[PDB]
């Protein structure tokens, strides 16, 4: 995992550890906004024309 993704996950873990589920969910939604829903494991480099 990248540095930033790990850092965001650690922040969510710490917020959960502080027994504060309110900003935990906010931080998780921020994670979703910044990194989206899925992670791309395979692409196809190429080109197309119509």
């Amino acid at each position: 995992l990248s540095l930033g993704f790990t850092k965001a996950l650690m922040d969510i873990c710490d917020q959960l550890e502080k027994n504060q589920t309110k900003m935990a969910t906010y931080l998780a939604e921020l994670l979703i906004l910044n990194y989206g829903t899925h992670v791309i494991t395979s692409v196809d480099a190429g080109a197309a024309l119509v």
Partner: protein, 216 residues
């Protein structure tokens, strides 16, 4: 549910030109019918007209002595009514004897299951409308790896009989409703489980795991 196939009956109303490609036999029966244990469901009946210039040559003999071959071309507007149906399971039909649904596509639309205007490997396209093709799987394993659960068809005039006998225009259960085709302003749609369809730009690699991470 079990989908036993489709067939598009073609009736010639003028000439014999249109129904040479608008007719579609059922794959399993080889005829415009449904396999045993299946009840044909009237999907949609519509008329189609097309003009064509047919050339014909005839040998006219007047007075049994003046024989001449005359060739003439006639511009005729052939009209044909096509009636397309689909075979749904009548009851507790044997499993998994039948056919599998690989999605449908038109020359102007896409098949979201394969994201292409074609049928997957081991699939056969059957003509269902003027521009609609259905991808049907004969092999059970290839279909099961290349199919989606099917719920039924319905039109703008006849709804789905499997609603929960009333026939409403609604996909039963958790089956989702997506457009299949528009024929002369009449909507035709199909029903597939909502979990398999998604945004579609990213094809998820949904193979393993078959369980969430098991806790210690």
């Amino acid at each position: 549910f079990t989908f036993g196939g489709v067939y598009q009956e073609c009736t010639e109303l003028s000439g014999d030109v249109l129904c040479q490609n608008l007719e579609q036999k059922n794959l399993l029966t080889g005829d415009f019918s449904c396999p045993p244990g299946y009840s044909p469901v009237h999907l949609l009946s519509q008329t189609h007209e097309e003009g064509y210039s047919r050339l014909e040559c005839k040998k006219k003999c007047t007075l049994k002595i003046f024989c001449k071959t005359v060739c003439e071309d006639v511009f005729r507007v052939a009209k044909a009514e096509f009636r397309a149906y689909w075979c749904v399971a009548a009851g507790q039909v044997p499993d998994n004897s039948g056919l599998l649904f690989g999605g449908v596509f038109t020359d102007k639309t896409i098949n979201p299951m394969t994201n292409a205007q074609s049928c997957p490997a081991g699939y056969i396209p059957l003509n269902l409308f003027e521009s609609l093709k259905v991808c049907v799987s004969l092999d059970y394993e290839l279909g099961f790896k290349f199919s989606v659960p099917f719920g039924g068809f319905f039109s703008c005039i006849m709804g789905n009989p499997l609603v929960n006998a009333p026939s409403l225009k609604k996909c039963p259960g958790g089956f989702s409703q997506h457009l299949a085709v528009i024929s002369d302003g009449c909507q035709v749609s199909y029903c597939v489980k909502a979990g398999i369809f998604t945004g579609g730009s990213l094809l998820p690699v949904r193979l393993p795991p078959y369980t969430k991470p098991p806790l210690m």
